[PDB]
């Protein structure tokens, strides 16, 4: 049974849903609150989200349902995560081990924000996550994994083929990768199946700096236009 999706209120843990884009069977397991910057002070409300049979999610993308049965596979994350069938609005309630879960994301999470623009009904969304080292073997060098979502907003195919990636980093060192596709694929965007999303590490040294990019579409018309990243940036240990 489908729900109506919340209109001013976060969804409690354990509320079965569908993305609003390529939509599958997913359950949230708490929200944390992110800074939008839409470059087309403003907070919004995310959510920590473990799919199944196929991640960060918005709340404008939770499409809820209720069902009955133990829908949700990967039952030996949510043997660990949630408590079985109850009696509350989410019959799903979260264990202890959700709530140390949730206490160690916390502080991860704070050096993540959320960077959209749209350029030529090409909305692009960005976000960074912190996964790194103080110190690396020899010398200090961490990463991070930044999630990429692109959105046809128009009726008109196109298609990404190149990437050009502009990452500077603290030191005053800045690389520049101008490369074919993304994750080794060209996705197509039209009337259906008109968003996609992919994610990747950047690697650093220094914990610090911003990173920009521009994709390369092409029309079925033989034009070829460029749109950009929002600039966001790779922060480390309680700094913005
Ligand atoms: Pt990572
Ligand atoms: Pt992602």
Redesign the pocket.
Same mark, same amino acid.
Request: proline share 0%; hydrophobic share 50%; aromatic share 50%.
């Given at each position: 049974v489908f729900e109506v999706p919340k209109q001013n209120g976060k969804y409690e843990t354990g509320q079965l849903f569908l993305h609003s884009i390529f939509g599958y069977r997913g359950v949230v397991l708490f929200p944390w609150q992110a800074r939008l910057y839409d470059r087309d002070g403003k907070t919004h409300t995310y959510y920590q989200v473990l799919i199944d049979a196929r991640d960060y999610v918005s709340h404008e993308d939770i499409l809820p349902y209720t069902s009955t049965d133990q829908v949700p596979i990967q039952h030996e994350l949510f043997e660990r995560f949630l408590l079985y069938d109850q009696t509350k609005a989410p019959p799903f309630v979260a264990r202890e081990t959700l709530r140390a879960w949730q206490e160690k994301n916390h502080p991860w999470l704070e050096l993540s924000d959320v960077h959209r623009e749209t350029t030529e009904n090409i909305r692009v969304t960005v976000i960074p996550?912190?996964?790194?080292m103080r110190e690396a073997q020899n010398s200090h060098v961490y $990463? $991070?994994?930044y999630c990429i979502r692109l959105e046809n907003l128009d009726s008109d195919v196109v298609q990404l083929r190149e990437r050009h990636w502009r990452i500077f980093s603290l030191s005053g060192t800045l690389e520049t990768v101008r490369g074919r596709g993304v994750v080794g694929r060209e996705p197509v965007l039209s009337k259906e199946q008109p968003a996609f999303q992919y994610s990747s590490?950047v690697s650093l040294q220094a914990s610090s700096g911003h990173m920009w990019g521009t994709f390369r579409f092409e029309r079925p018309d033989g034009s070829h236009f460029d749109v950009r990243i929002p600039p966001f940036s790779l922060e480390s240990n309680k700094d913005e």
């Open positions: 996550f912190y996964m790194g $990463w $991070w994994r590490h």
